[PDB]
Amino acid sequence: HMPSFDFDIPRRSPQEIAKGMVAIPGGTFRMGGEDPDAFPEDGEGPVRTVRLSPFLIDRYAVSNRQFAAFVKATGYVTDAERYGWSFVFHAHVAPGTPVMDAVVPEAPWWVAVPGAYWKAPEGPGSSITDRPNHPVVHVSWNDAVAYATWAGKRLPTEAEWEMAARGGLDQARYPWGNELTPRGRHRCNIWQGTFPVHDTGEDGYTGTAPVNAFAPNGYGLYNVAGNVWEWCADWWSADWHATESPATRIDPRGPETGTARVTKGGSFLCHESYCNRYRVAARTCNTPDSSAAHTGFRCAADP
Amino acid sequence: XATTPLCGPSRASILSG
Ligand SMILES: [Ca+2]
Ligand SMILES: [Ca+2]
Ligand SMILES: [Cl-]
Ligand SMILES: [Cu+]
């Protein structure tokens, strides 16, 4: 990918870049999933051993306060601001807010809201005054790459994201193990109740949570499962990674071309009765200028 | 789920006519 920016890339030291990041040593892990209920079109399989070079990865998704500092320093205008609208979940649109008639096929709970963007996540009249440490949302893949580049960083590959999110466990279902609420404790921010009609908020949140909510995984990463979908570097496919080759098993970058970029981790909207996509092997995608109230990112870096 | 559940709503997806 070859992006274009209208800000210069600032000089930053290794110590500055590494703040808030954890060092993942080089090594192998078992990537992918073979849950019999996985949707074939998602391409969770095959399970395979992947070798990665050492990398750094953010403990937290990028927050509102951090994204605000980037915008203040650069004047960056997000894709949602250029388009003039972004996607908001229906339950979060205040009555009377102007909304577009737009329809996401098969997903009527998504509303296209003029004026929804990172600083006004439910549309005009909303703000982030009480969410400085929540993940930034309504950021597209382009916006994420711009932030990451300004910060001296990059997006993780899907394999880097998954190695880090698995937190040293071999083929567990979730970042922390195989049970969703071990010891009766919520470990992530997803949906509870009846999707899309009623979220009971049993885990404490019916929207985004602070980036440091819940216990971390074994490598010190927070909210890799749930909270917000997280953009990765790779172009999406369902089958490129089914080939067994150095390109797909050593520092894999995904296919060279595509139409949508990978997103990982699930969000506050995910639920077992609908998508079941908060398992660590899960994966989907979105087109790179798209944005939504449940999608953000975390950065990686080369040491 | 009748077709594959959708978690990522795309700007392209709403264009239709
Ligand atoms: Ca929740
Ligand atoms: Ca996540
Ligand atoms: Cl906060
Ligand atoms: Cu989902």
Side-chain angles (χ1 to χ4, degrees):
Chain A
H1 178 70
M2 291 173 7
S4 68
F5 309 122
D6 307 296
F7 55 85
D8 290 353
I9 301 163
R11 173 186 280 241
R12 306 183 191 279
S13 64
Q15 109 164 15
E16 177 188 352
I17 291 166
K19 282 147 171 154
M21 308 194 78
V22 294
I24 308 297
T28 65
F29 81 117
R30 287 209 293 158
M31 187 172 179
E34 274 162 7
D35 188 307
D37 297 330
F39 311 132
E41 299 191 355
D42 285 359
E44 294 186 20
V47 177
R48 66 268 188 197
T49 301
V50 171
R51 178 175 303 279
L52 299 182
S53 298
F55 63 103
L56 292 160
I57 192 157
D58 281 343
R59 293 174 172 279
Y60 307 110
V62 173
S63 68
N64 282 320
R65 175 193 299 117
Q66 289 169 334
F67 198 81
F70 159 63
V71 172
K72 191 170 189 161
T74 63
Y76 184 74
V77 178
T78 64
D79 286 339
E81 292 167 279
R82 284 196 308 107
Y83 269 92
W85 65 268
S86 192
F87 286 120
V88 182
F89 188 68
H90 72 111
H92 296 153
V93 179
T97 299
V99 300
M100 295 155 60
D101 74 1
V103 173
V104 178
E106 316 302 331
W109 46 90
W110 283 113
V111 183
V113 180
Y117 77 114
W118 71 271
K119 219 192 303 183
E122 296 77 35
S126 72
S127 85
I128 51 171
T129 189
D130 295 324
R131 287 178 273 191
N133 203 38
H134 287 229
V136 68
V137 301
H138 300 299
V139 288
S140 71
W141 187 94
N142 299 315
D143 302 335
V145 169
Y147 177 94
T149 306
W150 172 82
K153 304 183 190 190
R154 58 179 174 79
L155 291 178
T157 69
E158 189 184 3
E160 284 169 344
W161 188 98
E162 198 179 304
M163 179 187 276
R166 286 180 176 281
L169 308 184
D170 179 25
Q171 283 284 302
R173 186 171 289 110
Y174 306 115
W176 52 84
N178 289 320
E179 304 186 12
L180 181 60
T181 60
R183 303 176 63 77
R185 299 287 86 200
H186 284 279
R187 306 299 306 268
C188 68
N189 176 20
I190 57 173
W191 186 279
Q192 293 88 41
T194 305
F195 180 82
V197 178
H198 177 69
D199 187 352
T200 62
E202 292 160 31
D203 62 29
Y205 310 91
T206 61
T208 58
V211 297
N212 70 334
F214 305 101
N217 77 0
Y219 289 166
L221 285 78
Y222 291 78
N223 300 292
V224 280
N227 218 28
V228 297
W229 284 101
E230 295 175 15
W231 291 113
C232 293
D234 305 32
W235 285 119
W236 169 268
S237 88
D239 65 352
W240 170 89
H241 47 286
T243 303
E244 298 283 343
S245 67
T248 67
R249 302 293 181 257
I250 305 169
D251 287 313
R253 302 252 285 273
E256 180 68 8
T257 55
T259 56
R261 297 285 186 174
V262 170
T263 58
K264 294 287 276 192
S267 81
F268 70 87
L269 296 174
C270 292
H271 193 264
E272 186 270 349
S273 78
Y274 180 62
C275 61
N276 198 32
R277 284 197 184 105
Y278 53 85
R279 294 168 297 103
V280 72
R283 57 200 304 272
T284 192
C285 62
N286 205 342
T287 58
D289 70 353
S290 295
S291 60
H294 73 341
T295 300
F297 67 109
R298 76 182 65 224
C299 296
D302 316 293
Chain B
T3 72
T4 304
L6 184 72
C7 296
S10 80
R11 295 181 183 282
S13 73
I14 66 162
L15 303 172
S16 176

PDB file of all heavy atoms in Angstrom, chain A residues 41 80 85 87 104-105 274-275 277 286 289-291 294, chain B residues 1 3-15, unseen atoms left out:
ATOM      1  N   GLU A  41     -17.496 -18.850   4.754  1.00  0.00           N
ATOM      2  CA  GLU A  41     -17.051 -17.680   4.023  1.00  0.00           C
ATOM      3  C   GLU A  41     -16.059 -16.837   4.806  1.00  0.00           C
ATOM      4  O   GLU A  41     -15.391 -15.993   4.203  1.00  0.00           O
ATOM      5  CB  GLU A  41     -18.263 -16.859   3.589  1.00  0.00           C
ATOM      6  CG  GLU A  41     -19.178 -17.637   2.662  1.00  0.00           C
ATOM      7  CD  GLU A  41     -20.232 -16.771   2.020  1.00  0.00           C
ATOM      8  OE1 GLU A  41     -20.309 -15.567   2.362  1.00  0.00           O
ATOM      9  OE2 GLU A  41     -20.982 -17.299   1.170  1.00  0.00           O
ATOM     10  N   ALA A  80     -14.829   9.820   7.446  1.00  0.00           N
ATOM     11  CA  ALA A  80     -16.214  10.103   7.822  1.00  0.00           C
ATOM     12  C   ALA A  80     -16.555  11.584   7.699  1.00  0.00           C
ATOM     13  O   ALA A  80     -17.686  11.938   7.336  1.00  0.00           O
ATOM     14  CB  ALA A  80     -16.502   9.613   9.239  1.00  0.00           C
ATOM     15  N   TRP A  85     -20.872  11.424   6.776  1.00  0.00           N
ATOM     16  CA  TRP A  85     -21.720  10.520   7.537  1.00  0.00           C
ATOM     17  C   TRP A  85     -20.904   9.303   7.931  1.00  0.00           C
ATOM     18  O   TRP A  85     -19.855   9.018   7.344  1.00  0.00           O
ATOM     19  CB  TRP A  85     -22.958  10.098   6.735  1.00  0.00           C
ATOM     20  CG  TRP A  85     -22.656   9.286   5.503  1.00  0.00           C
ATOM     21  CD1 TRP A  85     -22.456   9.752   4.239  1.00  0.00           C
ATOM     22  CD2 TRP A  85     -22.532   7.853   5.426  1.00  0.00           C
ATOM     23  NE1 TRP A  85     -22.215   8.705   3.379  1.00  0.00           N
ATOM     24  CE2 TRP A  85     -22.261   7.531   4.084  1.00  0.00           C
ATOM     25  CE3 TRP A  85     -22.641   6.813   6.356  1.00  0.00           C
ATOM     26  CZ2 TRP A  85     -22.089   6.217   3.656  1.00  0.00           C
ATOM     27  CZ3 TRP A  85     -22.463   5.510   5.930  1.00  0.00           C
ATOM     28  CH2 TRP A  85     -22.196   5.224   4.597  1.00  0.00           C
ATOM     29  N   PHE A  87     -21.591   5.144  10.156  1.00  0.00           N
ATOM     30  CA  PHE A  87     -22.563   4.161  10.637  1.00  0.00           C
ATOM     31  C   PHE A  87     -22.665   4.146  12.158  1.00  0.00           C
ATOM     32  O   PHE A  87     -21.647   4.024  12.847  1.00  0.00           O
ATOM     33  CB  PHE A  87     -22.177   2.760  10.173  1.00  0.00           C
ATOM     34  CG  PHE A  87     -22.425   2.502   8.712  1.00  0.00           C
ATOM     35  CD1 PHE A  87     -21.379   2.170   7.867  1.00  0.00           C
ATOM     36  CD2 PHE A  87     -23.710   2.564   8.187  1.00  0.00           C
ATOM     37  CE1 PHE A  87     -21.602   1.894   6.519  1.00  0.00           C
ATOM     38  CE2 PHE A  87     -23.940   2.296   6.836  1.00  0.00           C
ATOM     39  CZ  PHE A  87     -22.882   1.952   6.004  1.00  0.00           C
ATOM     40  N   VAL A 104     -27.991  -0.984   4.857  1.00  0.00           N
ATOM     41  CA  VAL A 104     -26.966  -2.010   4.735  1.00  0.00           C
ATOM     42  C   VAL A 104     -27.710  -3.324   4.537  1.00  0.00           C
ATOM     43  O   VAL A 104     -28.443  -3.757   5.439  1.00  0.00           O
ATOM     44  CB  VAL A 104     -26.084  -2.078   5.984  1.00  0.00           C
ATOM     45  CG1 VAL A 104     -25.053  -3.189   5.827  1.00  0.00           C
ATOM     46  CG2 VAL A 104     -25.400  -0.735   6.236  1.00  0.00           C
ATOM     47  N   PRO A 105     -27.579  -3.977   3.389  1.00  0.00           N
ATOM     48  CA  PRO A 105     -28.335  -5.212   3.171  1.00  0.00           C
ATOM     49  C   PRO A 105     -28.083  -6.214   4.285  1.00  0.00           C
ATOM     50  O   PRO A 105     -26.944  -6.447   4.692  1.00  0.00           O
ATOM     51  CB  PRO A 105     -27.810  -5.716   1.823  1.00  0.00           C
ATOM     52  CG  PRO A 105     -27.318  -4.512   1.142  1.00  0.00           C
ATOM     53  CD  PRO A 105     -26.745  -3.643   2.221  1.00  0.00           C
ATOM     54  N   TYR A 274     -25.788 -14.529  16.906  1.00  0.00           N
ATOM     55  CA  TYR A 274     -25.764 -13.915  15.591  1.00  0.00           C
ATOM     56  C   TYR A 274     -24.439 -14.254  14.926  1.00  0.00           C
ATOM     57  O   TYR A 274     -24.334 -15.262  14.211  1.00  0.00           O
ATOM     58  CB  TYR A 274     -26.045 -12.400  15.663  1.00  0.00           C
ATOM     59  CG  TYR A 274     -26.030 -11.762  14.288  1.00  0.00           C
ATOM     60  CD1 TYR A 274     -26.948 -12.147  13.313  1.00  0.00           C
ATOM     61  CD2 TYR A 274     -25.092 -10.795  13.961  1.00  0.00           C
ATOM     62  CE1 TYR A 274     -26.921 -11.586  12.051  1.00  0.00           C
ATOM     63  CE2 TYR A 274     -25.057 -10.226  12.703  1.00  0.00           C
ATOM     64  CZ  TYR A 274     -25.965 -10.621  11.751  1.00  0.00           C
ATOM     65  OH  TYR A 274     -25.905 -10.060  10.500  1.00  0.00           O
ATOM     66  N   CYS A 275     -23.402 -13.466  15.188  1.00  0.00           N
ATOM     67  CA  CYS A 275     -22.137 -13.605  14.472  1.00  0.00           C
ATOM     68  C   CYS A 275     -21.147 -14.536  15.154  1.00  0.00           C
ATOM     69  O   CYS A 275     -20.293 -15.114  14.475  1.00  0.00           O
ATOM     70  CB  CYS A 275     -21.471 -12.236  14.344  1.00  0.00           C
ATOM     71  SG  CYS A 275     -21.104 -11.485  15.942  1.00  0.00           S
ATOM     72  N   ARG A 277     -18.489 -13.774  16.607  1.00  0.00           N
ATOM     73  CA  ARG A 277     -17.188 -13.365  16.080  1.00  0.00           C
ATOM     74  C   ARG A 277     -16.270 -12.711  17.116  1.00  0.00           C
ATOM     75  O   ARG A 277     -15.325 -12.014  16.741  1.00  0.00           O
ATOM     76  CB  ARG A 277     -17.332 -12.476  14.843  1.00  0.00           C
ATOM     77  CG  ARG A 277     -17.695 -13.206  13.563  1.00  0.00           C
ATOM     78  CD  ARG A 277     -17.402 -12.317  12.363  1.00  0.00           C
ATOM     79  NE  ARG A 277     -17.811 -12.908  11.084  1.00  0.00           N
ATOM     80  CZ  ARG A 277     -18.879 -12.538  10.378  1.00  0.00           C
ATOM     81  NH1 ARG A 277     -19.704 -11.587  10.791  1.00  0.00           N
ATOM     82  NH2 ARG A 277     -19.137 -13.141   9.227  1.00  0.00           N
ATOM     83  N   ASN A 286     -13.757  -4.994   6.161  1.00  0.00           N
ATOM     84  CA  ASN A 286     -14.559  -3.856   5.740  1.00  0.00           C
ATOM     85  C   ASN A 286     -13.746  -3.089   4.703  1.00  0.00           C
ATOM     86  O   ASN A 286     -12.516  -3.185   4.653  1.00  0.00           O
ATOM     87  CB  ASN A 286     -14.970  -2.998   6.946  1.00  0.00           C
ATOM     88  CG  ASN A 286     -16.239  -2.205   6.699  1.00  0.00           C
ATOM     89  OD1 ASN A 286     -16.653  -2.010   5.554  1.00  0.00           O
ATOM     90  ND2 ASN A 286     -16.851  -1.725   7.775  1.00  0.00           N
ATOM     91  N   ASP A 289     -12.228   2.769   3.270  1.00  0.00           N
ATOM     92  CA  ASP A 289     -12.725   4.090   3.634  1.00  0.00           C
ATOM     93  C   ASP A 289     -14.003   4.039   4.457  1.00  0.00           C
ATOM     94  O   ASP A 289     -14.570   5.095   4.743  1.00  0.00           O
ATOM     95  CB  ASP A 289     -12.877   4.995   2.416  1.00  0.00           C
ATOM     96  CG  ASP A 289     -13.988   4.579   1.512  1.00  0.00           C
ATOM     97  OD1 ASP A 289     -14.597   3.509   1.729  1.00  0.00           O
ATOM     98  OD2 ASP A 289     -14.277   5.353   0.559  1.00  0.00           O
ATOM     99  N   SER A 290     -14.430   2.859   4.887  1.00  0.00           N
ATOM    100  CA  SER A 290     -15.611   2.739   5.718  1.00  0.00           C
ATOM    101  C   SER A 290     -15.284   2.995   7.176  1.00  0.00           C
ATOM    102  O   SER A 290     -14.163   2.789   7.645  1.00  0.00           O
ATOM    103  CB  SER A 290     -16.222   1.353   5.588  1.00  0.00           C
ATOM    104  OG  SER A 290     -16.697   1.173   4.275  1.00  0.00           O
ATOM    105  N   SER A 291     -16.316   3.418   7.908  1.00  0.00           N
ATOM    106  CA  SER A 291     -16.171   3.730   9.318  1.00  0.00           C
ATOM    107  C   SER A 291     -17.469   3.402  10.042  1.00  0.00           C
ATOM    108  O   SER A 291     -18.559   3.431   9.455  1.00  0.00           O
ATOM    109  CB  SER A 291     -15.766   5.188   9.513  1.00  0.00           C
ATOM    110  OG  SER A 291     -16.722   6.093   8.975  1.00  0.00           O
ATOM    111  N   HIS A 294     -18.398   0.972  15.975  1.00  0.00           N
ATOM    112  CA  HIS A 294     -17.863  -0.175  16.692  1.00  0.00           C
ATOM    113  C   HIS A 294     -16.506  -0.609  16.158  1.00  0.00           C
ATOM    114  O   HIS A 294     -16.090  -1.724  16.445  1.00  0.00           O
ATOM    115  CB  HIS A 294     -18.850  -1.344  16.668  1.00  0.00           C
ATOM    116  CG  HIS A 294     -18.954  -2.013  15.336  1.00  0.00           C
ATOM    117  ND1 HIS A 294     -18.535  -1.407  14.174  1.00  0.00           N
ATOM    118  CD2 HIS A 294     -19.421  -3.237  14.993  1.00  0.00           C
ATOM    119  CE1 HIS A 294     -18.744  -2.242  13.168  1.00  0.00           C
ATOM    120  NE2 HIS A 294     -19.272  -3.358  13.639  1.00  0.00           N
TER     121      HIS A 294
ATOM    122  N   UNK B   1     -26.480 -18.303  10.048  1.00  0.00           N
ATOM    123  CA  UNK B   1     -27.252 -17.248  10.497  1.00  0.00           C
ATOM    124  C   UNK B   1     -28.553 -17.194   8.354  1.00  0.00           C
ATOM    125  O   UNK B   1     -27.986 -18.136   7.851  1.00  0.00           O
ATOM    126  N   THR B   3     -27.994 -15.961   5.385  1.00  0.00           N
ATOM    127  CA  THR B   3     -26.719 -15.717   4.747  1.00  0.00           C
ATOM    128  C   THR B   3     -25.747 -15.313   5.846  1.00  0.00           C
ATOM    129  O   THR B   3     -26.121 -15.086   6.994  1.00  0.00           O
ATOM    130  CB  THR B   3     -26.824 -14.638   3.657  1.00  0.00           C
ATOM    131  OG1 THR B   3     -27.012 -13.357   4.265  1.00  0.00           O
ATOM    132  CG2 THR B   3     -28.003 -14.926   2.733  1.00  0.00           C
ATOM    133  N   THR B   4     -24.498 -15.239   5.499  1.00  0.00           N
ATOM    134  CA  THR B   4     -23.457 -15.101   6.501  1.00  0.00           C
ATOM    135  C   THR B   4     -23.694 -13.830   7.308  1.00  0.00           C
ATOM    136  O   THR B   4     -23.870 -12.758   6.721  1.00  0.00           O
ATOM    137  CB  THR B   4     -22.093 -15.031   5.808  1.00  0.00           C
ATOM    138  OG1 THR B   4     -21.932 -16.193   4.989  1.00  0.00           O
ATOM    139  CG2 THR B   4     -20.961 -14.963   6.828  1.00  0.00           C
ATOM    140  N   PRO B   5     -23.710 -13.904   8.634  1.00  0.00           N
ATOM    141  CA  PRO B   5     -23.870 -12.688   9.438  1.00  0.00           C
ATOM    142  C   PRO B   5     -22.865 -11.600   9.075  1.00  0.00           C
ATOM    143  O   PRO B   5     -21.718 -11.870   8.704  1.00  0.00           O
ATOM    144  CB  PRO B   5     -23.676 -13.198  10.871  1.00  0.00           C
ATOM    145  CG  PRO B   5     -24.260 -14.585  10.809  1.00  0.00           C
ATOM    146  CD  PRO B   5     -23.756 -15.114   9.477  1.00  0.00           C
ATOM    147  N   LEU B   6     -23.302 -10.356   9.219  1.00  0.00           N
ATOM    148  CA  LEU B   6     -22.534  -9.189   8.818  1.00  0.00           C
ATOM    149  C   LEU B   6     -22.170  -8.382  10.053  1.00  0.00           C
ATOM    150  O   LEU B   6     -23.061  -7.901  10.759  1.00  0.00           O
ATOM    151  CB  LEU B   6     -23.378  -8.335   7.872  1.00  0.00           C
ATOM    152  CG  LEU B   6     -22.625  -7.131   7.306  1.00  0.00           C
ATOM    153  CD1 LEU B   6     -21.597  -7.576   6.294  1.00  0.00           C
ATOM    154  CD2 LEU B   6     -23.575  -6.143   6.683  1.00  0.00           C
ATOM    155  N   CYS B   7     -20.871  -8.216  10.300  1.00  0.00           N
ATOM    156  CA  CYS B   7     -20.379  -7.337  11.352  1.00  0.00           C
ATOM    157  C   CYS B   7     -19.732  -6.060  10.834  1.00  0.00           C
ATOM    158  O   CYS B   7     -19.641  -5.097  11.592  1.00  0.00           O
ATOM    159  CB  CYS B   7     -19.402  -8.076  12.285  1.00  0.00           C
ATOM    160  SG  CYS B   7     -20.201  -9.435  13.174  1.00  0.00           S
ATOM    161  N   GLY B   8     -19.302  -6.012   9.579  1.00  0.00           N
ATOM    162  CA  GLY B   8     -18.630  -4.842   9.049  1.00  0.00           C
ATOM    163  C   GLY B   8     -19.452  -4.154   7.970  1.00  0.00           C
ATOM    164  O   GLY B   8     -19.470  -4.589   6.817  1.00  0.00           O
ATOM    165  N   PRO B   9     -20.153  -3.070   8.326  1.00  0.00           N
ATOM    166  CA  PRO B   9     -21.000  -2.344   7.360  1.00  0.00           C
ATOM    167  C   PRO B   9     -20.135  -1.433   6.498  1.00  0.00           C
ATOM    168  O   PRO B   9     -19.413  -0.573   7.005  1.00  0.00           O
ATOM    169  CB  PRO B   9     -21.943  -1.540   8.263  1.00  0.00           C
ATOM    170  CG  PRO B   9     -21.110  -1.274   9.481  1.00  0.00           C
ATOM    171  CD  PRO B   9     -20.215  -2.471   9.672  1.00  0.00           C
ATOM    172  N   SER B  10     -20.220  -1.602   5.181  1.00  0.00           N
ATOM    173  CA  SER B  10     -19.351  -0.860   4.282  1.00  0.00           C
ATOM    174  C   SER B  10     -20.103   0.254   3.571  1.00  0.00           C
ATOM    175  O   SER B  10     -21.313   0.178   3.310  1.00  0.00           O
ATOM    176  CB  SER B  10     -18.721  -1.765   3.230  1.00  0.00           C
ATOM    177  OG  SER B  10     -19.667  -1.999   2.204  1.00  0.00           O
ATOM    178  N   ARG B  11     -19.371   1.319   3.257  1.00  0.00           N
ATOM    179  CA  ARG B  11     -19.987   2.413   2.513  1.00  0.00           C
ATOM    180  C   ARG B  11     -20.476   1.948   1.151  1.00  0.00           C
ATOM    181  O   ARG B  11     -21.509   2.421   0.662  1.00  0.00           O
ATOM    182  CB  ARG B  11     -19.006   3.577   2.359  1.00  0.00           C
ATOM    183  CG  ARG B  11     -18.641   4.238   3.664  1.00  0.00           C
ATOM    184  CD  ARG B  11     -17.670   5.406   3.485  1.00  0.00           C
ATOM    185  NE  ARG B  11     -17.278   5.975   4.766  1.00  0.00           N
ATOM    186  CZ  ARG B  11     -18.031   6.803   5.485  1.00  0.00           C
ATOM    187  NH1 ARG B  11     -19.205   7.177   5.032  1.00  0.00           N
ATOM    188  NH2 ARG B  11     -17.610   7.276   6.645  1.00  0.00           N
ATOM    189  N   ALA B  12     -19.753   1.026   0.526  1.00  0.00           N
ATOM    190  CA  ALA B  12     -20.147   0.517  -0.779  1.00  0.00           C
ATOM    191  C   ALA B  12     -21.486  -0.195  -0.712  1.00  0.00           C
ATOM    192  O   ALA B  12     -22.232  -0.210  -1.703  1.00  0.00           O
ATOM    193  CB  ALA B  12     -19.079  -0.444  -1.303  1.00  0.00           C
ATOM    194  N   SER B  13     -21.803  -0.804   0.434  1.00  0.00           N
ATOM    195  CA  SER B  13     -22.938  -1.714   0.505  1.00  0.00           C
ATOM    196  C   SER B  13     -24.276  -1.011   0.374  1.00  0.00           C
ATOM    197  O   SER B  13     -25.262  -1.666   0.022  1.00  0.00           O
ATOM    198  CB  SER B  13     -22.913  -2.501   1.817  1.00  0.00           C
ATOM    199  OG  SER B  13     -23.274  -1.696   2.919  1.00  0.00           O
ATOM    200  N   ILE B  14     -24.341   0.296   0.652  1.00  0.00           N
ATOM    201  CA  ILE B  14     -25.615   1.012   0.627  1.00  0.00           C
ATOM    202  C   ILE B  14     -25.938   1.599  -0.736  1.00  0.00           C
ATOM    203  O   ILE B  14     -27.031   2.163  -0.912  1.00  0.00           O
ATOM    204  CB  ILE B  14     -25.664   2.137   1.677  1.00  0.00           C
ATOM    205  CG1 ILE B  14     -24.649   3.228   1.337  1.00  0.00           C
ATOM    206  CG2 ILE B  14     -25.419   1.572   3.059  1.00  0.00           C
ATOM    207  CD1 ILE B  14     -24.894   4.549   2.028  1.00  0.00           C
ATOM    208  N   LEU B  15     -25.028   1.499  -1.700  1.00  0.00           N
ATOM    209  CA  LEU B  15     -25.246   2.054  -3.029  1.00  0.00           C
ATOM    210  C   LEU B  15     -26.033   1.051  -3.861  1.00  0.00           C
ATOM    211  O   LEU B  15     -25.570  -0.072  -4.093  1.00  0.00           O
ATOM    212  CB  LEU B  15     -23.902   2.320  -3.693  1.00  0.00           C
ATOM    213  CG  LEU B  15     -22.937   3.244  -2.961  1.00  0.00           C
ATOM    214  CD1 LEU B  15     -21.599   3.234  -3.678  1.00  0.00           C
ATOM    215  CD2 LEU B  15     -23.491   4.655  -2.880  1.00  0.00           C
TER     216      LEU B  15
END
